[PDB]
Structure formats: structure tokens, C-alpha cells
Amino acid sequence: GEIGQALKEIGKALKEIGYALKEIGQALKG
Amino acid sequence: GEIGQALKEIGKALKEIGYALKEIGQALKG
Amino acid sequence: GEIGQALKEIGKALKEIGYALKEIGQALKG
Amino acid sequence: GEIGQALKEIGKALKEIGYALKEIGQALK
Amino acid sequence: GEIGQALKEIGKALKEIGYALKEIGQALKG
Amino acid sequence: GEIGQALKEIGKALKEIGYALKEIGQALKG
Numbered sequence: 634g635e636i637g638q639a640l641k642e643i644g645k646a647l648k649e650i651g652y653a654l655k656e657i658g659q660a661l662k663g
Numbered sequence: 664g665e666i667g668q669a670l671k672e673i674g675k676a677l678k679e680i681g682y683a684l685k686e687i688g689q690a691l692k693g
Numbered sequence: 694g695e696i697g698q699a700l701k702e703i704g705k706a707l708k709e710i711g712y713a714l715k716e717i718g719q720a721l722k723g
Numbered sequence: 724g725e726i727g728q729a730l731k732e733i734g735k736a737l738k739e740i741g742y743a744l745k746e747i748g749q750a751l752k
Numbered sequence: 753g754e755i756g757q758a759l760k761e762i763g764k765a766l767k768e769i770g771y772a773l774k775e776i777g778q779a780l781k782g
Numbered sequence: 783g784e785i786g787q788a789l790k791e792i793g794k795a796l797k798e799i800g801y802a803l804k805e806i807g808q809a810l811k812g
Contacts, residue, residue: 634784635664635666635667636666636667636670636784636785637784637785637788639667639670639671639674640670640785640788640789640792641788641791642670642671642674643670643673643674643677643792644788644791644792644795646674646677646678646680646681647677647792647795647796647798647799648795648798649678649681650677650680650681650684650795650799651795651798651799651802653681653684653685653687653688654684654799654802654803654806655802655805656685656688656692657684657687657688657691657802657806658802658805658806658809659688660688660691660692661691661806661809661810662809665694665696665697666696666697666700669697669700669701669704670700672701672704673700673703673704673707676704676707676708676710676711677707679708679711680707680710680711680714683711683714683715683717683718684714686715686718687714687717687718687721690718690721690722691721695724695726695727696726696727696730699727699730699731699734700730702730702731702734703730703733703734703737706734706737706738706741707737709741710737710740710741710744713741713744713745713748714744716748717744717747717748717751720748720751720752721751725753725755725756726755726756726759729756729759729760729763730759732760732763733759733762733763733766735763736763736766736767736769736770737766739767739770740766740769740770740773743770743773743774743776743777744773746774746777747773747776747777747780750777750780750781751780754783754785754786755785755786755789758786758789758790758793759789761790761793762789762792762793762796765793765796765797765799765800766796768797768800769796769799769800769803772800772803772804772807773803775804775807776803776806776807776810779807779810779811780810
């Protein structure tokens, strides 16, 4: 439905944020 | 609807947060 | 309504977070 | 109501995250 | 309810994210 | 339900973000 699909896109954006934070952590490790 | 469109804007703000973290990681990397 | 307005405030808070991250990335570039 | 109050608490958590990020920005200076 | 308790767990994770950012801020100036 | 399960995936993504931030903070110490 409308709300569920909108929540799935929010979940997708959060996974992308989580991925970007791992990259940051990798960068800080050298 | 009201709730669906409000969630959509939250989704956009989260994608923008992801983009900004991506840039931070690239700046730390380089 | 109650929920829609509360989701709008959450959306504004995420915009501010996104902005603060852009500021951090701009600092890291300068 | 139940959902609105839980969303207000989520907004409150987002304000503290914003605040911590601004302290991080100034720590980088 | 189902949704209320799910949103309370989301608030809980966000509070943990807040703390984690505080500790980053301390590691940075410290 | 659809919405409750979507919210649990969002909660899990946020716990993953908190965890990545703790790793960043630990890396900024050592």
C-alpha cells in the first residue's frame, strides 16, 4: 500500500546511510 | 495522502543525509 | 492532523541534520 | 495519542542528534 | 500496540545514535 | 502487519547505523 511502500523507501535510504558510515569507518582505518 | 506525502519528504531528507555522508567519506579518504 | 504534523516536524529535523552534515563535509574540504 | 506521542519522542531524539552533530562540527574547528 | 511499540524501538535506536555521536565528538576534541 | 514489519526493518537499520557510529568512535580513539 501507500504507507508501506513509503516505509520501504525510508528503509532503503537508511541502509544507504549505514553503508556510507561503514565507508567512513573504512576511511578512518586507512 | 497526508501521511504518504509526509513520509516521502522524510525519504528525501534521508537520501540527502546519505549523499552528505558519502561526501564526508570521500573527503576523509582523499 | 496529529500524525501528519508530527511527521512534518520529523522531516524538518532531518533537513537540519542533513545541513549539519554538509557543513561538516565542507569543513573537511577546507 | 499513542502514535503521536511516540513520534514526538522520535522528533526529540532527532533534535539531540542535530545538537551532537553541531558539536562535532565545532570540534573539527 | 504493534505500531506504538515499533515506534518506541525506533526512538530507542535514535537515542543510541545520539550517544554514539557524543562519543565521536569527545574522541575528536579529546 | 505490513506497517509493523516495515517499522521493524527501519528499527533494525537504525541499530545498524548506531553500531557503525560506535565503530567510527572507537577508530577515532585509536
